[PDB]
Amino acid sequence: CTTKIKP
Amino acid sequence: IVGGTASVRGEWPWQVTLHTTSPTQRHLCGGSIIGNQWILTAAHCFYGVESPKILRVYSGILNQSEIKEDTSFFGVQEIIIHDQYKMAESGYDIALLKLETTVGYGDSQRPICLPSKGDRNVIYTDCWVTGWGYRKLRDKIQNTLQKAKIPLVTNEECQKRYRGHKITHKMICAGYREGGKDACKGDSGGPLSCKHNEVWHLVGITSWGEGCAQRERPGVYTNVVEYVDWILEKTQAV
Ligand SMILES: COC(=O)Nc1ccc2c(c1)NC(=O)CC/C=C/C[C@H](N1CC[C@H](c3cccc(Cl)c3)OC1=O)c1nc-2c[nH]1
DSSP: OOSOOOO | OBSOEEOOTTSSTTEEEEEEOSSSOEEEEEEEEEETTEEEEOGGGGTTOOOGGGEEEEOSOSBGGGOOTTSOOEEEEEEEEOTTOSOGGGSOOOEEEEESSOOOOBTTBOOOBOOOGGGGSOOOOOEEEEESOOSSSSOOOOSBOEEEEOOEEOHHHHHHHSTTSOOOTTEEEEOOTTOOOBOOTTOTTSEEEEEETTEEEEEEEEEEOSSSSOTTOOEEEEEGGGGHHHHHHHHSOO
């Protein structure tokens, strides 16, 4: 998962 | 979904069913989990929705019959619609739902990867459209989540199929020349999921079409790769 979405 | 088959439980764990509570509770649209408080869906789903207070997001659902008054759901804190959005047919058909609480990931509910900017040139050959939508133009919402494998169509070919529309590179089309397999009413907002190098990527958001599964009328999807920076802008703020 190259694209990262921060929690 | 027209011409599809029943999904197996846990097959599309990023798939959600978005319900409206006003005037009565019913399925409204599909959506995809992309982060632990984030659902990616279509902007046109919120036509006439005056408040996020009427929305309920259900994850880890295979069958709509799993949903009763005692079924847990996620409340929506905020509806974020792309501010260039006017209507599905003109593009920018993309929206985020910021959830009131966080999704605990597991084998029934987990995020789908967004496409990479470098993957704008990759050719996806294993794409699937999912949802609880109609199986034909005049039908009803399905109990079981359906799936259909659909080929991607080039922008040039999609534009030939939609004379009178402007098919932009911010749209991505998918469908068989002879028709028969497509999204339909109730599927919009849901994912177009493509498997590449053993990883699923959210390639499209179910947006619009002329009817459902018609010959030479591919489904038109929001081309998610063209909105990765917009998504990060909204989800990674401050
Ligand atoms: C008991 O509960 C119900 O009965 N619930 C229910 C039933 C139908 C719909 C909705 C809810 N939801 C809305 O009305 C929300 C607003 C969305 C509007 C457009 C949407 N749509 C239009 C065609 C489009 C499409 C076609 C072909 C290819 C593609 Cl790539 C996309 O798919 C789609 O879902 C659609 N959904 C419904 C009607 N039309």
